[PDB]
C-alpha cells in the first residue's frame, strides 16, 4: 500500500479558505512519537512491535 | 448555456417533521454552493411556474389531489379516515405547505420537459423533483406527486420513445406502475432487493401487454462499490440504448446509493455515482436530470454540485469556496465523498447472471417472432 | 488425448487470430460499401422493428434514421 | 344429525376459505343468480315432482323458513373478518334492498353446511329435523349438479384502499 | 459529417482494399483513415473501437 499512502496524504490536505476562517485543526498533532525508518512499511512494523 | 437549471428560492423552507429524513434544505445548500462556485453564469436559471390541479390530475386522481389541496395539520384530526385511505400520515407526514411544495416540484419537472421540447435547452436540471414513489391514488415513501411521470407525459407529445433511469437505492415503483403497459417508455431501475422498502422489483417484473420487456429491474445485494456498479450499469444501459433507442432520457440522480446514508445500504463514492451521469451524457440525447432520495445533506449537496458542474462542462475546484453552510462540511472541507469498507456481497457470478438475463430480455424484443 | 487436442489447436493459431480479431473491421467494410449479407439485412430488420413502420416504402439502406 | 356434503362442494368451500382469508380475494356482491332466485328454482323443481298436499305444505313452509332465516342470519355468523368492510359498504350502497336479494349461493352453502351445529342447540322434533335435513341434502345435490350457472367463476382482488380500510 | 463525395468514396475504397487484402496489415488503413478523418476528432476517436 506504499502508493496508496501518498494518495491518501494528498487527499487529506488543508483548505486555504478554512485556514483563513480559523477552523482547521491539523491531524498530525494527535499522533504519538512516530518512528523514522526508511519505508512506511518499516514504520508500521515498528508500530506493530510497539503494540505487541 | 444548454443547461436549464430550475430553482425556486422557497423550496428550502418546507419542513417535514421532528426528525424526518427528507429535508428540502438540501436544494438550498446545492444552490448556495453553485452561486459561490460561479456556475450561475454558465447555467440558465428559471424560477419555475407552479403546477395546477389540472396539471397533476393528469397522472393522479381528482379525489386524491383535492384531498392534498384541502388538508391541513389542524384539520388532519377531522380528515383522519381519508388519510389512512390515501397513505398520508405515518411516513409521508402532513405538514405546512404540502401542496405548495408539491406544486413547486411538479412545476420544475414540467418546465424542464417543456424546455427540452421547445429546444431552448438540451439538459434540464431540477433537484426539487424526483419523487418516484408516488402512485396513482396514494402517497408513498416521502413522495406525494409523480413529477417524473408528469414530465414523461410532457415529453411524449414530441418524442416517440423515452427512457427513465433510476439509480436511487429503492425501486421506482410509482413510475413503473404508471408505465407498465406501454412501449413508449422504458423504465430501468437499479435497486436493492430483499428486505427493503418498496418490496417490488423482482428481476421477473418485465411488463405485461404491449409493455412486455419494457420494465428492466436490476436487483443488487448489500454493499455494492464503484467497480461492481460500473460493471452492472454500463452494459445494461448500452444494451438498452442499442435495442430500445430512446430520443430522451430522464435520469433520477438519487443519492441514497452513496456511502454513509441514513437509509441506504450501498457504498458508492462521488466518482462511482457520477460515472453514471457521464455515461448517460455521452450519448447526446436530450435529458432531464431530476433529484430524488438522499438523506445525508453534506454528501448530497456536494455530489449534486459536482454533477451540475459536470453537466455544464466546467470542472469545479477541489476546495469548497466560502458559502453560508461551510461548517456542515467535515474536518477536510473538500468536494468529495469517500467510500467506506462495508464488505461487499455482490459476487461476479451474481452480477453476470442478472446481466445476462436482462440482455436476453432486451434481445427478445427483436428476436422472437410476433 | 490432451496432447493431440493441444497440437491441433496450436496449429490452428495464426488463423484463429486473423479470422477472429480482424472480424470487427470486415463488418465495417460490408456496412460502408453496402453489400447485402444476411446479418446486414437482419440489422435493417432490427431498425425497422425499432422504428415501427406500417405500410410506407422502406427509405433506403443508409437512411433509416435511428441514427 | 349429520349431512352428506359432496366432495366437490367440500373442495370449493376450502378453496374459498383460502382465497378469502389468505390470498385477499373477495366476491362481487351483486350476484346475477340471486339467493331468492335459486331458492325459487329449487322450490319449483321439487314441487313439480312432489306427491301429496301434506308434503307440498311442509316443503313450502321449509323453504319459507329457509329464506327468512337467511335474511335474518347472513350478517351475524356467515362472513369472515375480511368481508365485514364489504358488508357495511354494501349496506350503505343499498340500504333498502335485502340480503336475500343481494348475496349468493356461495354464502347459502355456508348456511347449509353450518346448519348441523345450529340444530345441535335447537331441540325441536326429530320429524321436523329429518325433513329439513333431507331438504338440505337435495338442495346441495341440485347446486353441485347445476354448478355451471349458480357459482361464480373467478374471484376479485381487493383494492389497496380496501385493504388499508379493513387492516384486520 | 463528410458532405463532400470524394472523402467518403476514399473511405469506402480503402476499407474495400483492406477486406480484399490488397493492402498491408492495418498500417496504411489506419494512416489513411486518420488522414481523411482528421477534422472530426470524435469520429477519429470512435474509429479505434474497431481496431
Ligand atoms: Zn430512495
XYZ file of C-alpha atoms and ligand atoms in Angstrom:
709
model
C 0.000 0.000 0.000
C 3.007 2.315 -0.392
C 1.420 4.309 -3.222
C -1.970 4.474 -1.527
C -0.122 6.131 1.362
C 0.796 9.098 -0.827
C -2.654 9.144 -2.442
C -4.367 9.420 0.949
C -1.858 12.017 2.135
C -2.701 14.109 -0.932
C -6.382 13.564 -0.150
C -6.030 14.986 3.380
C -4.607 18.449 2.668
C -5.599 21.785 4.240
C -8.014 24.190 2.591
C -6.822 27.821 2.434
C -10.332 29.198 2.984
C -10.690 27.084 6.125
C -7.264 28.217 7.319
C -8.248 31.855 6.825
C -11.549 31.218 8.618
C -9.541 29.738 11.528
C -11.346 26.395 11.737
C -8.672 23.955 10.501
C -7.370 21.549 13.152
C -4.428 19.537 11.862
C -4.339 15.789 12.425
C -0.574 15.303 12.811
C -0.679 16.825 16.316
C -2.502 13.757 17.672
C -0.010 11.030 16.742
C 2.461 9.962 19.414
C 6.191 9.588 18.750
C 6.307 8.305 15.160
C 9.378 6.244 14.198
C 11.743 7.418 11.471
C 12.717 4.489 9.262
C 13.224 4.482 5.510
C 9.927 2.882 4.472
C 6.336 3.364 5.576
C 6.187 -0.415 5.931
C 9.080 -0.291 8.383
C 7.361 2.460 10.363
C 4.135 0.480 10.544
C 6.191 -2.561 11.548
C 7.785 -0.693 14.436
C 4.280 0.341 15.464
C 3.141 -3.293 15.383
C 6.080 -4.242 17.589
C 5.147 -1.447 19.983
C 1.606 -2.791 20.251
C 2.939 -6.322 20.784
C -25.876 27.590 -21.724
C -27.676 24.468 -22.936
C -28.279 23.503 -19.290
C -31.516 24.931 -17.898
C -31.371 24.966 -14.090
C -34.646 25.175 -12.169
C -34.671 26.540 -8.629
C -37.353 28.280 -6.580
C -35.906 30.289 -3.694
C -38.594 28.984 -1.373
C -38.071 25.237 -1.715
C -35.652 25.021 1.173
C -38.060 26.366 3.780
C -40.507 23.444 3.893
C -40.200 21.120 6.866
C -41.372 17.525 7.096
C -41.354 16.792 10.811
C -39.371 16.469 14.024
C -36.557 14.135 12.917
C -37.554 13.208 9.397
C -35.003 12.092 6.792
C -36.317 14.145 3.862
C -35.231 17.786 4.080
C -35.842 20.238 1.219
C -32.966 22.203 2.747
C -30.545 20.259 0.547
C -31.723 22.148 -2.529
C -30.798 25.425 -0.856
C -27.397 24.006 0.072
C -26.797 22.948 -3.538
C -27.829 26.339 -4.863
C -25.547 28.206 -2.474
C -22.564 26.057 -3.411
C -23.427 26.734 -7.064
C -23.798 30.507 -6.749
C -20.489 30.640 -4.891
C -18.727 28.392 -7.398
C -19.920 30.901 -10.051
C -21.837 28.342 -12.104
C -24.689 30.880 -12.062
C -23.325 32.402 -15.263
C -22.739 29.203 -17.230
C -26.187 27.922 -16.235
C -29.632 29.264 -17.171
C -31.750 29.952 -14.099
C -35.543 29.792 -14.377
C -37.811 30.253 -11.372
C -40.462 27.624 -12.124
C -44.169 28.188 -12.637
C -46.342 26.374 -10.125
C -48.357 23.364 -11.189
C -52.150 23.286 -11.094
C -54.729 20.705 -10.084
C -55.428 20.206 -13.783
C -51.714 19.586 -14.290
C -51.416 16.999 -11.521
C -54.679 15.189 -12.251
C -53.025 14.054 -15.487
C -51.417 11.227 -13.530
C -53.254 11.405 -10.190
C -56.917 11.048 -9.312
C -59.171 14.013 -8.687
C -60.200 12.974 -5.179
C -56.580 12.444 -4.127
C -55.406 15.804 -5.426
C -58.424 17.548 -3.891
C -57.502 15.996 -0.553
C -53.927 17.226 -0.937
C -55.278 20.703 -1.660
C -57.646 20.713 1.316
C -55.575 19.039 4.052
C -54.045 20.991 6.940
C -52.114 19.892 10.054
C -55.007 21.198 12.157
C -57.938 19.646 10.274
C -55.996 16.380 9.992
C -57.894 15.035 13.014
C -61.217 15.500 11.220
C -59.765 14.252 7.913
C -58.404 11.107 9.659
C -60.232 8.413 7.582
C -59.303 9.706 4.126
C -55.742 9.972 5.443
C -55.458 6.275 6.225
C -57.062 5.651 2.830
C -54.575 7.891 0.976
C -51.482 6.757 2.951
C -50.823 10.315 4.180
C -49.996 10.459 7.866
C -47.372 7.934 9.008
C -44.192 8.172 6.902
C -45.431 10.815 4.437
C -46.472 13.294 7.113
C -48.901 16.141 6.562
C -47.063 19.410 7.122
C -47.260 23.118 6.360
C -47.246 23.959 2.674
C -47.539 20.381 1.431
C -49.463 21.383 -1.679
C -47.098 24.297 -2.242
C -44.026 22.056 -2.155
C -45.666 19.523 -4.454
C -46.585 22.314 -6.871
C -43.023 23.666 -6.858
C -41.513 20.265 -7.615
C -44.013 19.319 -10.314
C -43.703 22.723 -11.953
C -39.951 22.295 -12.090
C -40.331 18.956 -13.841
C -42.978 20.085 -16.342
C -40.919 23.169 -17.138
C -37.870 21.008 -17.773
C -39.868 18.890 -20.201
C -41.224 21.972 -21.955
C -37.692 23.348 -22.308
C -36.481 20.101 -23.875
C -39.467 20.213 -26.240
C -39.072 23.853 -27.274
C -35.367 23.235 -27.864
C -34.063 26.126 -25.768
C -32.068 23.540 -23.822
C -30.667 20.043 -24.127
C -30.044 19.302 -20.440
C -32.628 20.327 -17.847
C -31.774 20.099 -14.146
C -34.381 20.022 -11.367
C -33.307 18.840 -7.936
C -36.530 19.703 -6.110
C -38.249 16.902 -8.022
C -37.752 13.195 -8.489
C -40.435 11.823 -6.165
C -40.700 8.390 -7.760
C -42.638 6.509 -5.071
C -45.953 8.330 -5.542
C -48.722 6.227 -7.045
C -51.947 6.951 -8.888
C -54.091 7.090 -5.748
C -51.846 7.176 -2.657
C -48.661 8.753 -1.371
C -45.665 6.593 -0.518
C -42.047 6.922 0.545
C -41.910 10.638 1.393
C -43.449 11.304 -2.048
C -46.793 12.817 -3.000
C -46.872 13.737 -6.716
C -45.039 11.886 -9.507
C -43.334 14.753 -11.272
C -41.281 12.195 -13.203
C -44.467 10.783 -14.727
C -45.866 14.232 -15.490
C -42.569 15.090 -17.202
C -42.616 11.882 -19.241
C -46.119 12.663 -20.451
C -44.982 16.127 -21.482
C -42.021 14.659 -23.369
C -44.134 12.107 -25.240
C -46.018 14.913 -27.000
C -42.959 15.375 -29.221
C -40.678 12.371 -28.591
C -41.545 8.841 -29.669
C -39.587 6.861 -27.047
C -38.463 7.842 -23.547
C -36.036 6.129 -21.174
C -36.162 6.532 -17.392
C -33.071 5.551 -15.394
C -33.347 5.212 -11.609
C -30.156 4.888 -9.563
C -31.808 5.559 -6.216
C -31.332 2.670 -3.799
C -35.087 1.971 -3.927
C -37.273 0.731 -6.758
C -39.051 3.258 -8.935
C -42.346 1.649 -8.038
C -44.568 4.589 -8.923
C -43.122 5.231 -12.360
C -43.036 1.523 -13.172
C -46.690 1.118 -12.223
C -47.535 4.166 -14.308
C -45.813 2.940 -17.471
C -46.149 -0.824 -17.002
C -48.319 -1.363 -20.083
C -46.727 0.830 -22.738
C -43.798 0.536 -25.121
C -43.149 4.266 -25.481
C -41.479 4.480 -22.057
C -38.864 2.030 -20.792
C -38.060 2.096 -17.087
C -34.639 0.819 -15.999
C -34.153 0.828 -12.233
C -31.162 -0.362 -10.216
C -32.092 -1.113 -6.633
C -31.560 -3.194 -3.505
C -33.948 -6.145 -3.448
C -34.772 -8.320 -0.482
C -35.904 -6.997 2.878
C -36.144 -3.383 1.788
C -38.778 -0.701 1.477
C -40.720 -0.948 -1.795
C -40.728 -4.742 -1.866
C -41.336 -4.604 -5.600
C -38.600 -5.014 -8.161
C -38.001 -8.683 -8.884
C -35.917 -9.492 -11.949
C -39.069 -11.072 -13.390
C -41.277 -7.951 -13.345
C -40.869 -7.186 -17.029
C -44.230 -5.702 -18.041
C -47.484 -7.023 -19.456
C -49.371 -6.315 -22.633
C -47.655 -4.082 -25.159
C -45.120 -3.199 -22.474
C -43.659 -6.693 -22.319
C -39.886 -6.381 -21.784
C -40.007 -2.620 -21.200
C -39.502 -2.648 -17.449
C -35.913 -3.514 -16.535
C -35.124 -4.240 -12.896
C -31.569 -4.779 -11.695
C -31.618 -6.132 -8.137
C -28.447 -5.902 -6.111
C -27.246 -7.077 -2.724
C -25.792 -5.137 0.187
C -22.632 -3.107 -0.194
C -22.012 -2.513 -3.890
C -18.976 -0.424 -4.782
C -17.849 1.662 -7.732
C -16.337 -1.092 -9.883
C -19.220 -3.526 -9.390
C -21.821 -0.838 -10.045
C -19.954 0.138 -13.202
C -19.837 -3.462 -14.412
C -23.600 -3.817 -13.974
C -24.565 -0.304 -15.134
C -22.597 0.263 -18.317
C -23.514 -2.974 -20.159
C -27.210 -2.728 -19.303
C -27.533 0.907 -20.349
C -25.584 0.315 -23.557
C -27.786 -2.654 -24.452
C -30.896 -0.596 -23.660
C -29.735 2.289 -25.823
C -28.994 -0.214 -28.587
C -32.212 -2.233 -28.672
C -34.695 0.413 -27.479
C -33.164 3.585 -28.881
C -34.735 6.477 -26.980
C -34.946 10.094 -28.010
C -34.996 11.474 -24.454
C -33.650 10.318 -21.095
C -34.971 11.078 -17.607
C -32.274 10.355 -15.033
C -33.168 10.195 -11.340
C -29.847 11.092 -9.757
C -30.905 9.953 -6.287
C -28.006 9.906 -3.836
C -29.126 7.435 -1.212
C -26.938 4.925 -3.047
C -23.904 6.763 -1.670
C -21.779 5.724 1.304
C -22.882 6.808 4.739
C -26.615 7.224 4.232
C -29.228 7.088 6.971
C -31.412 4.758 4.912
C -29.221 3.409 2.127
C -27.064 0.317 2.176
C -24.636 0.929 -0.695
C -21.012 2.030 -0.971
C -20.758 4.372 -3.931
C -18.494 7.413 -3.883
C -18.717 10.722 -5.702
C -16.905 9.183 -8.666
C -18.958 5.993 -8.776
C -22.204 7.953 -8.621
C -21.049 10.368 -11.334
C -19.692 7.916 -13.894
C -23.384 7.068 -14.335
C -24.233 10.658 -15.245
C -21.209 10.784 -17.534
C -22.094 7.577 -19.367
C -25.629 8.812 -19.944
C -24.483 12.285 -21.023
C -22.138 10.637 -23.518
C -24.984 9.748 -25.942
C -26.003 13.313 -26.926
C -29.672 12.799 -26.167
C -31.915 15.415 -24.548
C -32.024 14.676 -20.845
C -33.770 15.767 -17.661
C -31.693 15.260 -14.523
C -34.081 15.168 -11.580
C -33.232 14.812 -7.932
C -34.668 12.154 -5.674
C -33.618 10.488 -2.458
C -30.579 11.361 -0.390
C -30.826 11.755 3.366
C -27.329 12.917 4.401
C -27.253 16.551 3.456
C -23.489 17.134 3.253
C -22.830 14.283 0.828
C -25.995 15.162 -1.084
C -25.058 18.814 -1.535
C -21.501 18.125 -2.637
C -22.394 15.304 -5.033
C -25.200 17.253 -6.687
C -22.992 20.322 -7.054
C -20.339 18.188 -8.735
C -22.915 16.670 -11.073
C -24.284 20.090 -12.018
C -20.761 21.213 -12.848
C -20.096 18.063 -14.859
C -23.260 18.548 -16.920
C -22.432 22.205 -17.530
C -18.944 21.092 -18.600
C -16.923 23.017 -16.031
C -14.624 21.032 -13.758
C -15.165 22.595 -10.351
C -12.319 23.170 -7.926
C -11.466 20.685 -5.189
C -11.703 23.077 -2.230
C -15.152 24.263 -1.193
C -15.400 28.048 -1.611
C -16.815 30.333 1.044
C -20.513 29.599 1.468
C -23.097 30.159 4.173
C -23.027 26.446 5.066
C -19.311 25.762 5.396
C -19.335 24.177 8.850
C -21.658 21.457 7.527
C -18.682 20.028 5.652
C -16.331 17.991 7.728
C -12.813 18.339 9.056
C -11.450 18.455 5.498
C -13.663 20.899 3.535
C -13.319 19.151 0.181
C -15.658 18.341 -2.707
C -15.650 14.568 -2.403
C -17.468 11.692 -0.750
C -15.180 8.789 0.082
C -16.375 5.212 0.403
C -16.240 3.002 3.468
C -15.249 -0.633 3.871
C -18.585 -2.412 4.478
C -17.563 -5.723 2.881
C -19.272 -6.287 -0.459
C -21.812 -9.024 -1.121
C -22.284 -8.926 -4.916
C -20.344 -11.800 -6.423
C -19.245 -11.661 -10.032
C -21.387 -14.709 -10.749
C -24.480 -12.964 -9.381
C -23.878 -9.780 -11.356
C -23.117 -11.696 -14.558
C -26.232 -13.849 -14.195
C -28.590 -10.911 -13.719
C -26.938 -9.031 -16.582
C -27.272 -11.982 -18.974
C -30.944 -12.316 -18.069
C -31.596 -8.627 -18.729
C -29.750 -8.829 -22.045
C -31.809 -11.807 -23.181
C -34.994 -9.933 -22.266
C -33.955 -6.865 -24.255
C -32.943 -9.025 -27.224
C -36.279 -10.860 -27.256
C -37.878 -7.573 -28.319
C -36.381 -8.041 -31.791
C -35.756 -11.781 -31.997
C -38.711 -13.984 -31.104
C -41.321 -13.803 -33.895
C -44.535 -11.832 -33.450
C -5.880 -37.034 -25.704
C -4.689 -33.745 -24.209
C -1.545 -33.806 -26.340
C -3.458 -34.331 -29.587
C -6.010 -31.625 -28.746
C -3.303 -29.099 -27.885
C -1.401 -29.936 -31.066
C -4.406 -29.315 -33.321
C -5.381 -26.071 -31.572
C -1.889 -24.596 -31.512
C -1.540 -25.306 -35.211
C -4.861 -23.542 -35.933
C -3.450 -20.461 -34.214
C -2.280 -17.734 -36.634
C -5.630 -18.250 -38.332
C -7.841 -18.023 -35.273
C -6.085 -14.678 -34.798
C -6.756 -13.386 -38.302
C -10.361 -14.533 -38.548
C -11.435 -13.607 -35.012
C -9.509 -10.409 -34.226
C -9.886 -8.606 -37.550
C -13.551 -9.661 -37.517
C -14.503 -6.192 -36.338
C -13.342 -4.355 -39.474
C -14.879 -6.551 -42.162
C -18.386 -5.703 -40.887
C -17.271 -2.109 -41.338
C -16.492 -2.911 -44.968
C -19.846 -4.553 -45.682
C -21.552 -1.630 -43.939
C -19.714 1.245 -45.609
C -19.759 -0.286 -49.081
C -23.272 -1.526 -48.624
C -23.143 -5.166 -49.695
C -26.167 -7.183 -48.659
C -25.322 -10.113 -46.410
C -27.660 -11.948 -44.080
C -26.555 -10.107 -40.966
C -26.783 -6.644 -42.549
C -30.335 -7.395 -43.593
C -31.147 -8.684 -40.129
C -29.800 -5.427 -38.651
C -32.044 -3.484 -41.006
C -34.975 -5.615 -39.814
C -33.923 -4.687 -36.285
C -34.013 -0.989 -37.135
C -37.412 -1.309 -38.829
C -38.788 -3.086 -35.766
C -37.407 -0.260 -33.630
C -38.974 2.479 -35.750
C -42.291 0.552 -36.069
C -43.120 1.023 -39.732
C -46.566 0.143 -41.050
C -47.137 0.389 -44.806
C -44.880 3.044 -46.368
C -41.877 2.331 -48.557
C -38.602 1.416 -46.906
C -36.425 4.519 -47.267
C -33.022 3.103 -48.233
C -30.213 1.032 -46.785
C -28.344 4.001 -45.184
C -31.357 6.248 -44.471
C -33.423 4.571 -41.784
C -32.846 7.177 -39.067
C -32.461 5.895 -35.538
C -29.048 7.499 -36.081
C -77.720 -35.106 12.868
C -75.105 -35.364 10.128
C -75.201 -34.274 6.498
C -73.744 -35.570 3.227
C -71.782 -32.805 1.507
C -70.352 -33.778 -1.902
C -66.597 -33.707 -2.270
C -66.760 -31.051 -4.983
C -68.519 -28.714 -2.561
C -66.011 -29.540 0.179
C -63.148 -28.666 -2.166
C -64.907 -25.460 -3.212
C -65.519 -24.443 0.401
C -61.888 -24.967 1.368
C -60.690 -23.129 -1.740
C -62.974 -20.214 -0.891
C -61.757 -20.204 2.720
C -58.188 -19.927 1.454
C -58.949 -17.368 -1.263
C -60.853 -15.005 1.016
C -58.641 -15.326 4.071
C -55.035 -15.722 2.941
C -54.958 -14.542 -0.692
C -57.081 -11.390 -0.193
C -59.768 -12.084 -2.790
C -63.459 -11.247 -2.445
C -66.704 -11.993 -4.287
C -68.659 -9.478 -6.340
C -71.611 -8.769 -4.067
C -74.402 -8.065 -6.611
C -74.966 -11.571 -7.964
C -76.532 -12.445 -11.295
C -78.179 -15.556 -9.788
C -79.893 -14.307 -6.653
C -80.366 -16.257 -3.434
C -84.104 -15.767 -3.853
C -83.750 -16.896 -7.468
C -82.004 -20.160 -6.595
C -84.433 -20.814 -3.740
C -87.358 -20.328 -6.111
C -85.793 -22.530 -8.782
C -85.222 -25.433 -6.399
C -88.681 -24.981 -4.893
C -90.352 -25.092 -8.300
C -88.295 -28.091 -9.399
C -89.165 -30.097 -6.298
C -92.859 -29.188 -6.154
C -93.246 -30.091 -9.834
C -92.459 -33.685 -8.794
C -93.848 -33.830 -5.241
C -96.656 -36.277 -4.466
C -99.254 -35.207 -1.872
C -100.589 -31.969 -0.441
C -99.175 -32.582 3.047
C -95.704 -32.867 1.529
C -96.399 -29.755 -0.551
C -97.268 -27.836 2.607
C -94.260 -28.962 4.618
C -91.887 -28.236 1.737
C -93.363 -24.768 1.226
C -93.036 -23.881 4.896
C -89.499 -25.303 4.925
C -88.482 -23.036 2.051
C -90.096 -20.075 3.801
C -88.154 -20.820 6.973
C -85.011 -21.066 4.862
C -85.391 -17.669 3.199
C -86.373 -15.843 6.384
C -83.505 -17.424 8.312
C -81.021 -16.444 5.618
C -82.236 -12.844 5.634
C -82.035 -12.777 9.434
C -78.714 -14.630 9.708
C -76.268 -13.568 6.964
C -74.677 -10.605 8.715
C -74.139 -12.399 12.016
C -72.422 -15.775 11.517
C -71.695 -16.139 7.791
C -68.789 -13.823 6.889
C -65.072 -13.820 7.620
C -63.233 -10.938 9.252
C -62.097 -9.857 5.767
C -65.628 -9.238 4.478
C -67.248 -7.033 7.130
C -65.908 -3.932 5.370
C -67.524 -5.045 2.119
C -70.703 -5.839 4.042
C -71.034 -2.369 5.531
C -70.181 -0.827 2.159
C -72.968 -2.842 0.539
C -75.402 -1.851 3.285
C -74.529 1.803 2.705
C -74.927 1.374 -1.056
C -78.295 -0.452 -0.968
C -79.997 0.304 2.371
C -83.463 -0.572 1.026
C -82.793 -3.899 -0.691
C -82.290 -7.004 1.417
C -79.610 -9.643 1.810
C -81.749 -12.388 0.269
C -81.802 -10.196 -2.847
C -78.126 -9.202 -2.522
C -75.895 -12.194 -1.719
C -75.484 -15.601 -3.373
C -75.171 -19.371 -3.192
C -71.539 -19.006 -2.131
C -72.972 -17.995 1.260
C -76.173 -20.009 1.112
C -73.967 -23.101 1.209
C -72.168 -21.790 4.291
C -75.589 -21.567 5.917
C -76.453 -25.095 4.782
C -73.183 -26.697 5.898
C -73.342 -24.936 9.256
C -76.964 -25.934 9.948
C -75.977 -29.114 11.898
C -74.250 -27.285 14.752
C -77.237 -24.938 14.982
C -79.771 -27.756 15.136
C -77.435 -29.088 17.814
C -78.538 -26.299 20.156
C -82.081 -26.352 18.783
C -84.033 -29.369 20.016
C -87.300 -29.479 18.075
C -88.975 -32.703 16.951
C -86.949 -35.349 15.151
C -89.531 -35.472 12.360
C -89.052 -31.798 11.517
C -85.284 -32.203 11.827
C -85.147 -35.080 9.365
C -87.452 -33.349 6.885
C -85.349 -30.185 6.909
C -82.090 -32.114 6.657
C -83.260 -34.206 3.707
C -84.339 -30.987 2.014
C -80.869 -29.513 2.584
C -79.312 -32.673 1.138
C -81.395 -32.460 -2.023
C -80.569 -28.757 -2.312
C -76.836 -29.434 -2.087
C -77.169 -32.096 -4.770
C -79.071 -29.702 -7.030
C -76.453 -26.980 -6.600
C -73.479 -29.252 -7.258
C -75.314 -30.500 -10.337
C -76.060 -27.038 -11.741
C -72.592 -25.710 -10.762
C -72.104 -24.120 -14.187
C -74.802 -21.473 -13.656
C -75.072 -20.744 -9.927
C -71.449 -20.448 -8.788
C -69.037 -17.627 -9.571
C -66.030 -18.447 -11.740
C -63.221 -16.063 -10.722
C -62.724 -14.073 -7.538
C -61.828 -10.388 -7.339
C -58.755 -8.868 -5.726
C -59.462 -6.284 -3.061
C -58.007 -2.845 -3.860
C -55.247 -1.230 -1.778
C -57.671 1.281 -0.267
C -59.968 -1.571 0.776
C -57.101 -3.450 2.395
C -55.918 -0.362 4.268
C -59.527 0.126 5.378
C -60.011 -3.378 6.783
C -56.496 -3.962 8.110
C -57.625 -6.911 10.233
C -20.091 14.625 -41.246
C -18.359 14.297 -44.639
C -20.727 16.017 -47.060
C -18.159 16.027 -49.872
C -18.220 12.940 -52.064
C -14.535 12.011 -52.588
C -13.781 11.734 -48.873
C -16.319 9.014 -48.223
C -15.605 7.459 -51.614
C -12.000 7.149 -50.444
C -13.007 5.572 -47.147
C -15.262 3.100 -48.979
C -12.460 2.121 -51.346
C -9.872 1.815 -48.574
C -11.982 -0.430 -46.370
C -12.692 -2.439 -49.530
C -8.977 -2.852 -50.178
C -8.301 -3.955 -46.609
C -11.059 -6.545 -46.881
C -9.752 -7.828 -50.223
C -6.242 -7.936 -48.675
C -4.792 -5.666 -51.372
C -3.102 -3.548 -48.680
C -0.855 -4.026 -45.672
C -1.655 -5.030 -42.090
C -3.609 -2.032 -40.823
C -0.749 0.435 -41.274
C -1.894 2.182 -44.446
C -5.536 1.746 -43.415
C -5.013 3.475 -40.070
C -2.959 6.195 -41.730
C -5.475 6.956 -44.463
C -8.466 6.875 -42.110
C -6.775 9.167 -39.596
C -5.885 11.459 -42.504
C -9.279 11.664 -44.219
C -10.989 11.908 -40.809
C -8.706 14.476 -39.185
C -11.028 17.473 -38.914
C -13.537 15.442 -36.850
C -11.780 14.248 -33.684
C -14.847 12.499 -32.276
C -15.058 10.177 -35.275
C -11.280 9.782 -35.349
C -11.503 8.559 -31.756
C -14.541 6.364 -32.393
C -12.812 4.524 -35.236
C -10.469 2.943 -32.687
C -13.295 0.791 -31.327
C -12.958 -1.326 -34.485
C -9.224 -1.995 -34.249
Zn -34.576 6.337 -2.357
